[PDB]
Amino acid sequence: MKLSEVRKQLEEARKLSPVELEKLVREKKRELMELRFQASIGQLSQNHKIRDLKRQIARLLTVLNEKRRQ
RNA sequence: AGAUGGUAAGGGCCCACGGUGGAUGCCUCGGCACCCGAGCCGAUGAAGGACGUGGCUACCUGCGAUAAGCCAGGGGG
Ligand SMILES: [Mg+2]
Numbered sequence: 001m002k003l004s005e006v007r008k009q010l011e012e013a014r015k016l017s018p019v020e021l022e023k024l025v026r027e028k029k030r031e032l033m034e035l036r037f038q039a040s041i042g043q044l045s046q047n048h049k050i051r052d053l054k055r056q057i058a059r060l061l062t063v064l065n066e067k068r069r070q
Numbered sequence: 071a072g073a074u075g076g077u078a079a080g081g082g083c084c085c086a087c088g089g090u091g092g093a094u095g096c097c098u099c100g101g102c103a104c105c106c107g108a109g110c111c112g113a114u115g116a117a118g119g120a121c122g123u124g125g126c127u128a129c130c131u132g133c134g135a136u137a138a139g140c141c142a143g144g145g146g147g
């Protein structure tokens with residue numbers, strides 16, 4: 001993902017609530033499964049997408065944790 | 071009558087060139103010694119592991135379902 005889009009993800013994420021973070025992670029985890037399936041039948045040429053999503057989910061969960069941590 | 075040479079199945083010595091083999095010289099990612107520095111970790115679960123972890127991944131390294139990585143500060147260019 002582009003560095004600027006990462007900052008953007010963090011700012012937008014940091015504005016969210018725990019619950020909104022949970023919904024969004026769950027959606028991204030879903031979107032990853034779709035990607036996995038496509039990789040397995042050979043229809044995902046754009047395979048950088050998998051590394052990306054996995055890190056968005058990390059970043060989000062990382063932030064969720066920030067939120068709950070205090 | 072007499073007498074003396076060309077035989078090489080193969081062998082031997084020498085010479086040339088090779089094959090095998092990995093000495094020797096040079097080399098060094100490594101080791102060794104001394105000196106200096108520095109010296110605890112663990113229930114906030116250690117040391118050390120198992121199994122995982124990559125779009126394609128046998129192994130090693132890294133990492134832990136947030137899985138060759140997540141956030142922030144500093145450095146660097
Ligand atoms: Mg004769």
Ligand SMILES: [Mg+2]
Pocket residue numbers: 078
């Ligand atoms: Mg002969």
Ligand SMILES: [Mg+2]
Pocket residue numbers: none
């Ligand atoms: Mg002969």
Ligand SMILES: [Mg+2]
Pocket residue numbers: 082
């Ligand atoms: Mg002889």
Ligand SMILES: [Mg+2]
Pocket residue numbers: 088
């Ligand atoms: Mg020879």
Ligand SMILES: [Mg+2]
Pocket residue numbers: none
């Ligand atoms: Mg020498």
Ligand SMILES: [Mg+2]
Pocket residue numbers: 109
């Ligand atoms: Mg020590």
Ligand SMILES: [Mg+2]
Pocket residue numbers: none
């Ligand atoms: Mg350990």
Ligand SMILES: [Mg+2]
Pocket residue numbers: none
């Ligand atoms: Mg491993």
Ligand SMILES: [Mg+2]
Pocket residue numbers: 006
């Ligand atoms: Mg990042």
Ligand SMILES: [Mg+2]
Pocket residue numbers: none
């Ligand atoms: Mg940094």
Ligand SMILES: [Mg+2]
Pocket residue numbers: none
């Ligand atoms: Mg920086």
